[PDB]
Design a protein around this ligand. Structure first.
Ligand code: VNL
Ligand code: VNL
Lengths: 455, 455
């Protein structure tokens, strides 16, 4: 009977309890093969040789064209639009009127009055809502991320999107291009040759080495992929599968999964009435040890997850007054948490204990998340909640379990905190959750992007 | 340049070294979603509620019709054909002229002059070779297993094939049928109602509870699946994904992966010349600690992997004279090995050791195989090789790592052996293999199907 999020929340009891017991299952990185060689070798390659990341299937694409396209973005993003011209991309971050992050994605300025958003569903839903109800002269084509379990059905996208990354990426790129290719400034766009095609590029990189994101019409996907794999054999390039792929951000430092902060607030009711009952926001899940009966305690603002530097008070935008009221110097800060290896061994050991009444929450490798929004409590030595751990897994490059978190600003790097791993009372009813007991895992605060930190 | 297996072996150096360093990658259970809920809950359901196993995509189907169909099977199988009539299936096991197992699969006797084989590629390749070159009046339609990495391409089969299993399976089955359904003898075939369709059935079961395998034309797959899932909600039935699925045989006791024993022998040269260079036999891989430079040391005969009881000297068949010469009472015997939980914890602990020069071979969960043929050495206390471990993984139902093995017949159940886990010299060049050191894992000999055994 409910057709939108507002009706779902009115009929669903406590919002936190609903989301933490959602039956949606795992957040899937679809279609791309889970592994091409093995996930350890694939992780190793992006730090030691080169990789092809296949990004064609796990993000929503919004193609935004028209006289008011730039205005729509400017009105909804914290980012400065000043001096923005085609062939520059930005990390689009929208906040609510209350100053809280809705989501984020990459916005490509392709040409005059022509943009494309690439990212998770929440910020795309927000753009579509405003395009439709705000009176913008703009046309939008929504190309959803691919189905999670296609089960043999054909899958189409409008565009393929790859990245070539690793210390030997630029060697592969120039071999493909047929000569030297200029390294532009980060997120500037140009073009390159691949197998006789003119392929648009986005300057990118990771682990201190320059790389590229590239895209094109879906029809040429195989032609480009096969050229890249062939040219890259000389440099050890290998394709990365969907099992290893999302663990890259544990090393790179981007938190993909802030809760869209749209469940409360009178100024967000119209948006809740617009969001379908089967939307990401209505049907998804929250997993982890952090418990509050107030869904607002799961929200973050942009300063808390590393987007402070993007905020520019040089244009009108939704939530500007709220962000202006925030003191940046006292906001929580994004960090990497390096999980204690002895504690990790104890988590896994419990799976092989035939006599214990319970084991610790299964920690999948290399990505351990079990909802699309992750919220584990971070505790200090007294047991106070001092932060939220929001993305969790393991790096074969570091031989460490790692998580990305936001913690009280005064906590120094090197401090040993605890992450509460697992859920209370045997676990919520999410279909990703087997029965388990919790563990207070020791974790050392470390920089983002991750760098090995002395305790 | 090589077009067949014989040319591949002539140009490829030592046959063992070729197979143990093959670049084929993992043996994939394709297309079906890796997980629907999570693999632990899915494993639990087949012992505690009910499951839908989706078997549509991982086996080769051979449709065999014609006057000489039964003769073709009879001439090539160790099984008795005496009194075989439509609506009975058999576990077809062919051996070479030298008495060694080629493979095995399920052969359904559907009607007069109409059969279907379902199983891995090796026994299907053997049937096709003899149908084609032996002068049999028979027509064969080969429906390959689905591609390992479809990457969004559509996937078709001629038939869908499911199983409904678990202690509540028969409740679900009778709910679907609309009333009582007779439990026939094992592997006898009949029919049932599903959503107004007449669906053919094969009497099956596991863990002491009766179940069914069912099939039909691919077009009705979704209609049947949705009816089964709907009727089964009352009994807790859940679908099982491809990650959990193949671990079922660790509990059930069937070894899927004997090496097709066709690489040597003058009487098998014609078959090697017929097998394509991209066949399973030519392109696949051998993984694990057992090392011999003679590929014949990887062969098994039917007595060694539990098919002794199928051998019937009441018909002419390939390899009969060799099997008649074998003494059944002194052959190695199939067992389950229950791996020591402390040793398992030490394997996983090494992944989180930031100072060690090496870690132990990654043991994936719930299936740890990293080739399509598995060959780990089993050692006694003196270090003698006393068997071969051939399929490896973990059961959440038992909280134990388990493997299926064949060992010297005189070794009593309860004996503590060791399985050598990992490969020598840092590991072979297979793309599934990360660098690692070996471990002698303690393992207790246990019955097949697995039953908890006092040491
Ligand atoms: C940019 O693509 C990514 C997306 C996600 C996600 O949505 O969880 C994670 C890591 C990624 O690299
Ligand atoms: C009968 O289907 C199965 C096939 C395999 C395989 O081929 O490795 C393993 C377990 C199975 O249940």
């Amino acid at each position: 009977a409910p057709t939108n999020l507002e009706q779902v929340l009115a009929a669903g009891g406590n919002t936190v309890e609903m989301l933490r017991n959602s039956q949606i299952g795992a957040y899937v990185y679809p279609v791309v093969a889970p592994e091409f060689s093995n996930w350890r070798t694939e992780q190793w390659a992006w730090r030691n040789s080169a990789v092809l990341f296949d990004q064609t299937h796990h993000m929503v694409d919004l193609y935004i064209r028209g006289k008011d396209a730039l205005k729509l973005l400017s009105d909804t993003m914290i980012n400065s639009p000043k001096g923005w011209e085609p062939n520059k991309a930005k990390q689009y971050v929208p906040v609510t009127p209350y100053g809280h992050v809705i989501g984020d994605g990459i916005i490509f300025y392709l040409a005059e009055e022509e943009f494309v958003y690439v990212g998770r569903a929440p910020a795309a839903n927000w753009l579509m809502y405003h395009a439709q109800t705000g009176g913008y002269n703009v046309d939008i084509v929504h190309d959803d991320r691919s189905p999670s379990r296609p089960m043999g059905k054909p899958v189409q996208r409008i565009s393929w999107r790859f990245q070539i990354q690793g210390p030997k990426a630029w060697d592969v790129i120039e071999k493909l291009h047929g000569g030297t290719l200029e390294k532009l400034k980060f997120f500037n766009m140009a073009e390159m040759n691949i197998a006789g095609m003119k392929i648009r590029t986005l300057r990118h990189g990771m682990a201190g080495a320059p790389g590229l994101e590239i895209w094109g019409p879906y029809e040429t996907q195989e032609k480009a992929r096969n050229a890249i794999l062939e040219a890259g054999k000389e440099f050890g390039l290998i394709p990365v599968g969907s099992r290893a792929y999302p663990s890259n951000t544990l090393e790179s430092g981007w938190i993909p999964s802030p809760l869209p902060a749209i469940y409360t607030g009178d100024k967000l009711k119209a948006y809740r009435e617009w969001l379908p009952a089967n939307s990401y926001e209505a049907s998804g899940a929250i997993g982890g040890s952090f418990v509050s009966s107030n869904i607002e305690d799961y929200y973050v603002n942009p300063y808390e997850i590393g987007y402070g530097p993007f905020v520019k008070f040089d244009h009108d935008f939704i939530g500007r007054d709220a962000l202006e009221a925030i003191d940046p110097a006292t906001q929580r800060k994004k960090v990497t948490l390096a999980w204690n290896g002895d504690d990790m061994a104890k988590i896994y050991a419990s799976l092989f204990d035939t006599e214990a009444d319970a084991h610790y929450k299964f920690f999948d490798l290399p990505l351990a998340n079990y909802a699309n929004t992750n919220a584990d409590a971070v505790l200090d030595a007294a047991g106070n909640v001092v932060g939220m751990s929001m993305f969790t897994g393991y790096s074969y490059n570091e031989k460490r379990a790692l998580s990305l978190a936001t913690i009280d600003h005064e906590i120094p790097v090197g401090t040993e905190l605890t992450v509460l791993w697992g859920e209370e009372n045997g676990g919520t009813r999410k279909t990703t959750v087997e029965p388990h007991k919790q563990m207070a895992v020791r974790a050392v605060v470390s920089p983002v992007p991750y760098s090995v930190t002395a305790r």
